[PDB]
Amino acid sequence: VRLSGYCWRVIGYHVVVWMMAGIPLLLFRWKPLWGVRLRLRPLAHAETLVIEIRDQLFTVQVQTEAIRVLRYYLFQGQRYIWIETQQAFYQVSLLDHGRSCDDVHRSRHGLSLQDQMVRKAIYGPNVISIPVKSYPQLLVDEALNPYYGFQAFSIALWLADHYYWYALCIFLISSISICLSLYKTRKQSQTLRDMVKLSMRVCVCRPGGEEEWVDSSELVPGDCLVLPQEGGLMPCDAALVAGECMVNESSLTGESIPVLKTALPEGLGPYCAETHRRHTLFCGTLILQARAYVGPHVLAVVTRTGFCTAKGGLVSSILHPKHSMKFVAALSVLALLGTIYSIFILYRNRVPLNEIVIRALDLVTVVVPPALPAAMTVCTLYAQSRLRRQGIFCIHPLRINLGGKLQLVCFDKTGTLTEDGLDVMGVVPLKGQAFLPLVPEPRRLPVGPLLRALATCHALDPMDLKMVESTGWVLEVLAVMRPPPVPVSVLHRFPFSSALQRMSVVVAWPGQPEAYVKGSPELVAGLCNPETVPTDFAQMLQSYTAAGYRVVALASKPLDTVEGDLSLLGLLVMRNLLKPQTTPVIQALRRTRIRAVMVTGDNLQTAVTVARGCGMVAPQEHLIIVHATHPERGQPASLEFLPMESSRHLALSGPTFGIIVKHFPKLLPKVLVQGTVFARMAPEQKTELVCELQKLQYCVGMCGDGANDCGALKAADVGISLSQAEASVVSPFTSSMASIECVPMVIREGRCSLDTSFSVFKYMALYSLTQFISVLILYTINTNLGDLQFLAIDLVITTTVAVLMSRTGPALVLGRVRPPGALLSVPVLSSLLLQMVLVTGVQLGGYFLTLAQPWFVPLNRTVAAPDNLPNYENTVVFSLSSFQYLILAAAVSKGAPFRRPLYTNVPFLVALALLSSVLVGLVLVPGLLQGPLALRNITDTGFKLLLLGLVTLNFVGAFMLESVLDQCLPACLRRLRPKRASKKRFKQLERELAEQPWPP
C-alpha cells in the first residue's frame, strides 16, 4: 500500500514502444515498472500521474478542478482529494470521520449555496458513473490476448507462403469472434450503466428558506432532504433527523416487509450507521411512507453520496473484482527442437535461404494450432443453444465449462428457495382458555365472528390480500362481502396506525354492530380481556415465532370505545412456503456430493426452519448455532456454540460472520468448511463469503434472484439469476423459469462442455502433433505435403470431426464422479504420448515398407519440395496420415458418464463413414482425385492391401488403447503410492475436522 507521483518524453516512449513491436508484451509481462518509469518521467506534491502498489501496480491520472485549486483522483470508484495541511491525498469518505450526532443535528437546517458548491467540488456528483469505453479502448483492453497475436503472425506467414485459403478462414473466424466479443462486452457495460442510473426531482431546504427542487446529482453530505409524504425511491444514504418512516429494504435484506425507521437519537458520541442502522435511510430502499408527527414535514440529513453509499460500495465491488490448456514449456521446446532440426536438415539439403526461413517458420504453426480456441468454443455454443432451447440464457459460453467442475452452490432464501411472499398456514380459533387445532384452510369453520373477521378486517398490502383470498369472501358503508350464509357490510373503519400496530373495523349484517381488531399477538392479547385470553399465549407464541412463522391476533366485541375491551377470536399464522420444486433438486444435488448452502438476508429462525424443511440439513445431521459477541473493550470477543434438536452443520449469523472474519482468521476455514446457513448477510458480506470460499479452492456458484445478491453473483464462478431484471445484468446465466431446477440442468450441461472440451483439445493436439511428424518425415527427404493436401487436412477433416464430435448431450442423470479438472493430468498426457507412439510407429513402418519394393524409385532431391510431386513417399505418407486423423478423432471422443454414448450422434458416425470411404477410394480407385492432390497412383494391389491393413491396425490399436487406459489406469495409479492426500484446501480441512472435529 505505497505510491509515487510522476510528472517530450511521451514521444520517445511512444516511438520506443511502437518501434519495438513487442515491448508491449514486456511491459505487459512481469516487469511493467520500467515502461511507466520512462513514460511517466519521474513527487507526490507535484505530479501529473500517480502509481500505487497494493501489498498490485495501478496507474491513475491526477484530475483537477477549480473552486481556489483542487486536486483529486478516482480509484476503484472511490475518490481521493489532496490536502495541503498534510500535503497528501486522503480518501473523501474519511474526510469527516467520527462526526458527533449533535453535529449532524446542527445541520437540521440545510446547507448554504456556497457551501453546497464547494462541498460538491470535494465529494463530487451523486451519480454512479460507469466508465463505458469506446471500441478501441475495449479492443486494446479485452482483446490483447497473445494467442490472437500468434494467429496474426501465422496468417501473415501463410500469406507469405501462398497458403491463402486457410489464412482467410482463420482470419474470418478470429475477426468475427473478436467483433462479437467487443459488441457484447460493450452491451453489458451499457446495460449496467442503465441499471445503476438514477434520476429524480428531490426537494432540499436552505437556511434562507424556500425549499428548492434539484436533481439527484446535486446532493452532497450535509444538506437534508424533505422526504415526501407519499414515498418513492431514496436517492442516497441519509440519517433521519425529524419524523418516522416505513421503508422497504428489499434491496439490502431481500425481504419486502415494511421496516420502521425513527429519528436519530440526539446526543454526543459518533454516528456510524452500523449501530444507528435503525435511524438511517439507505440508498435504493423504497420508502413506503414518511409521517412526521412533529413540525411541517419529515427531514433526513445526507451522510454519503455517489460511490460512498452502500449501493455505491456494492456497485464498486461489482465493477472491480481450462486454465491449464495454455501450457507453454513443452510446446515451445518441441517447436524449437523441430525448427533447429529443420534448419540443420535443410542446410544439409541445399535449398535457397528464403525457402529455408519460410519452411522453418511454418513448422511452429504446424505444432501450435492457430484454430485451437475456435475448436474449444464450438461445444460451448452447442451447450448455449441447448440451454436457450430450455429457458436458461447465457452471455459468456466459455463460462459453461465451469458448470462441469462446480462443487458448491449457494442459494438465496426468499424468492429462490421459497415463494416470493407469505401464505396462510391456518387460523387458530379458541373458545375458552385453549386453542383449537390449527385449521389448514380457513374455509371450513362455523359462521361465527372469527370467519367474519377473517373476511372483513383489511385495508382494501399483500398480507390482507392473502387473508381475503384464502377465506374466499368476495368484495363488492364502505363494502359488502359475499360468502361462497349472509352478506356482511362494513359500517365503519379506521386506518392501520403505523405507531401502534392495530387495525380496527366495525361491521354489520342483515341479521348487533360488531367490531374486529387485527394486530400483533402480544399487544392485542394485552388489549383483550384476560378471561378469554388463555394462559399459554407465551408458549404458543414462542412456538410459532421461533419456528420462523408470523402470527396475527384477531379480537372482537359486539357494539377508544372500539379498541378497548376486547376478546381474542384466534390467531392467523403465515409462513414463506418452499417452492414445490426445491426439495427434489436439493436432495439430487446432495446425493452427488454437491454442497448446498443457504445465504440469506432473513432472520436466523426462518433460515434454519427452511433449511431443515427443504433437506439441506437432514433430520439426523447435527446443527449448531455459532454466536460471536462483539468486543466489549474489557474482554476480547469469544465464540459460543449452541446446539439444537438433532455430518455436522453450522449456522452463522451476520454480525457474527464479520466478527469471525475480523477477530478469528485462523478458525474461519473450519467454520466455512462445515457451515450451511448464513443469515443476516449484508450485500457485501455475500461477496466476502463467496471470495473466502473461492480462496479455499472451491468452484462456487450461487442462484440468487434479488437485487441484494448481485455482487455475489458476479464473484461466483457460475452465477444464475431467477429474475429478468436487477440481477440478469451481472449474472452469466439467467433463467426465465424461477425455481432451483435450473441449477442441476446447468451442471449437467457444464459437464458435457468440460468433457467435450477435453476430447476436442486432445484431438487438436494430436491433429497438430501427428501432422508435425509427417511434415518432418517429408522434410527429411526434401519434400512437403502439398497445398491441396495441407488444405484437405486443415479445412475439411479437422472442421468436420471437431464440430461433429461436440453434438453429444448429457446422460440425463448426475453421477457421483466429477470430470477431470485439468488438461495436464496424468491420464491426458499418457493418452497423447501413447497414441503418438502408436501413430509414429505406423507412419514410420509404412515409410520403411514402401522402400522395400521392386517397383519403388526414390525422388531426386535436387529439386525443390513442391516440385518433387507427384511422389511415392508423399502419397504413401499422406494416405496413412489422412486415415490416422479420422482414427484419432473417432477414438478420442467418449460417451458415458458425462455424455450420451458415442453411437447416438449419427451425423458424426456418418461423416466418419463418408470421409473414410473417400479416403479408401483415393488409396484404391485410380486417378479420380489424384490430379488435384499430387499422388503417384500405386499400381501394386498387394501393397495397397498392406496399407489398408496398417491403417486397420492403427484403428484397432487406438480403440483398444483408449479402452484399456480408461479401464485400468486409475487402478495402477492408486495401487502405487496410495497415500494421496489431495492438495485442495477444503479437502485437507475436511480431513483435519474428520479426524479431530475442532468444536467439541
Ligand SMILES: CCCCCCCC(=O)OC[C@H](COP(=O)(O)O[C@@H]1[C@H](O)[C@H](OP(=O)(O)O)[C@H](O)[C@H](OP(=O)(O)O)[C@H]1O)OC(=O)CCCCCCC
Ligand atoms: C511430468 C509431470 C507429470 C504430471 C504430474 C502431475 C501430478 C500428478 O501426477 O498427479 C498426482 C497423481 C494423481 O493425480 P492427478 O490425477 O494427476 O491429478 C491430481 C490429483 O488427482 C487431484 O485429485 P484427487 O487427489 O484424486 O482428489 C486433482 O485431480 C488435481 O488435478 P485437477 O487440477 O484436475 O483437480 C491433481 O492434484 O498421482 C498418481 O496417481 C501417481 C502418478 C506418479 C507418476 C509421477 C509423474 C511424474
Ligand SMILES: CC(C)CCC[C@@H](C)[C@H]1CC[C@H]2[C@@H]3CC=C4C[C@@H](OC(=O)CCC(=O)O)CC[C@]4(C)[C@H]3CC[C@]12C
Ligand atoms: C486476427 C487478426 C487478423 C486481428 C484482427 C483484428 C480486427 C478484427 C480489428 C482490427 C481493427 C479493428 C477496428 C478498429 C476500429 C474500428 C472503428 C470503429 O468505428 C469508429 O471509428 C467509431 C468508434 C466509436 O466512436 O466508439 C468500429 C470498429 C472498428 C472497425 C474495429 C473492428 C475490429 C478491427 C477490424
Ligand SMILES: CC(C)CCC[C@@H](C)[C@H]1CC[C@H]2[C@@H]3CC=C4C[C@@H](OC(=O)CCC(=O)O)CC[C@]4(C)[C@H]3CC[C@]12C
Ligand atoms: C467453414 C468453417 C469455418 C467451419 C464453420 C462451421 C460452422 C458452419 C458451425 C460452427 C458453429 C456451428 C453451430 C453450433 C451450434 C449449433 C446449435 C445446434 O443446436 C442444437 O442442435 C441443440 C438444440 C436442440 O436441438 O435442443 C444447431 C446447429 C448450430 C447452430 C451449429 C451450426 C453450424 C455452425 C455455425
Ligand SMILES: CC(C)CCC[C@@H](C)[C@H]1CC[C@H]2[C@@H]3CC=C4C[C@@H](OC(=O)CCC(=O)O)CC[C@]4(C)[C@H]3CC[C@]12C
Ligand atoms: C476445396 C475443397 C476441399 C472444398 C471444401 C469445402 C469445405 C469448406 C466444406 C466441406 C465439408 C463441409 C462440412 C460438412 C458438414 C458440416 C456439418 C454441419 O453440421 C451442422 O450444421 C450442425 C449439425 C447439428 O447441430 O446436428 C456444419 C458444417 C460442416 C462442418 C461443413 C462445413 C464446410 C465443409 C468443411
Ligand SMILES: CCCCCCCCCCCCO[C@@H]1O[C@H](CO)[C@@H](O[C@H]2O[C@H](CO)[C@@H](O)[C@H](O)[C@H]2O)[C@H](O)[C@H]1O
Ligand atoms: C477448427 C474448427 C474451427 C471452428 C470454427 C467455428 C467456431 C467459431 C467460433 C468463434 C468464437 C465465437 O464466440 C465468441 O468468441 C469469443 C472468444 O473466442 C468469446 O469471448 C470470450 O472472451 C471474452 C473476453 O475476452 C468474454 O467477454 C466473452 O464472454 C467470452 O466468451 C465470445 O463470448 C464468444 O461468443
Ligand SMILES: CC(C)CCC[C@@H](C)[C@H]1CC[C@H]2[C@@H]3CC=C4C[C@@H](O)CC[C@]4(C)[C@H]3CC[C@]12C
Ligand atoms: C527464429 C525466428 C525466425 C522466429 C521469429 C518469429 C517471431 C516474429 C514470432 C514468434 C512468436 C510471435 C509473438 C507471439 C506473441 C505475441 C504477443 C502479441 O501481444 C504481440 C505479438 C507477439 C509478440 C508475436 C509476434 C511475432 C512473434 C514474435
Ligand SMILES: CC(C)CCC[C@@H](C)[C@H]1CC[C@H]2[C@@H]3CC=C4C[C@@H](O)CC[C@]4(C)[C@H]3CC[C@]12C
Ligand atoms: C522465439 C521462440 C520462443 C519461438 C516462438 C515460440 C512461440 C510460438 C511461443 C512463444 C511464447 C508462447 C506463448 C506463451 C503464452 C501463451 C499462453 C496463452 O495466451 C496461449 C498460448 C501462448 C500464447 C503461447 C503459445 C506459443 C508461444 C507463442
Ligand SMILES: CC(C)CCC[C@@H](C)[C@H]1CC[C@H]2[C@@H]3CC=C4C[C@@H](O)CC[C@]4(C)[C@H]3CC[C@]12C
Ligand atoms: C466458406 C468460407 C468463406 C467460410 C465462411 C464461413 C462463415 C459463414 C462462418 C465464419 C464464422 C461463423 C460464425 C461464428 C459464430 C457464430 C455464432 C453462433 O451463435 C451462430 C453462428 C455464427 C454466426 C457462425 C456462422 C457461420 C460463420 C459466419
Ligand SMILES: CC(C)CCC[C@@H](C)[C@H]1CC[C@H]2[C@@H]3CC=C4C[C@@H](O)CC[C@]4(C)[C@H]3CC[C@]12C
Ligand atoms: C464403415 C467403414 C468404412 C469403417 C468405419 C466404421 C467406424 C467408424 C464405425 C462402425 C461402427 C462404429 C462403432 C459402433 C459402436 C461402438 C460402441 C460405442 O462404445 C462407441 C464405439 C463403437 C465401437 C463405434 C466406433 C465407430 C465405428 C467402429
Ligand SMILES: *[C@@H]1O[C@H](CO)[C@@H](O)[C@H](O)[C@H]1NC(C)=O
Ligand atoms: C532430378 O532433377 C532433374 C531436373 O531436371 C530431373 O530431370 C531428374 O529426374 C533428376 N535428376 C537425375 C540426375 O536423375
Ligand SMILES: CCCCCCCCCCCCCC
Ligand atoms: C476429402 C478431401 C478431398 C479434397 C478435394 C480437393 C478438390 C480440389 C478441387 C480442385 C482444385 C485444383 C484443380 C486445378
Ligand SMILES: [NH3+]CCC[NH2+]CCCC[NH2+]CCC[NH3+]
Ligand atoms: N497446418 C498449417 C500448415 C500449413 N502449411 C502450408 C504450407 C504450404 C506450402 N506451399 C508451398 C507453395 C510454394 N510456392
Ligand SMILES: CCCCCCCCCCCC
Ligand atoms: C474457401 C475455401 C477454398 C476453396 C477455393 C480454393 C480451391 C483450391 C484452389 C487451388 C488452386 C491451385
Ligand SMILES: CCCCCCCCCC
Ligand atoms: C457473414 C458474417 C456475419 C454472420 C452473422 C453474424 C451474427 C448474426 C446474428 C443474428
Ligand SMILES: CCCCCCCCCC
Ligand atoms: C462484420 C460482421 C459483423 C457481424 C456481427 C455483428 C453483430 C450481430 C448482432 C450480435
Ligand SMILES: CCCCCCCCCC
Ligand atoms: C451460416 C449462417 C447461419 C448461422 C445461424 C444459424 C442458426 C440456426 C438456429 C437453429
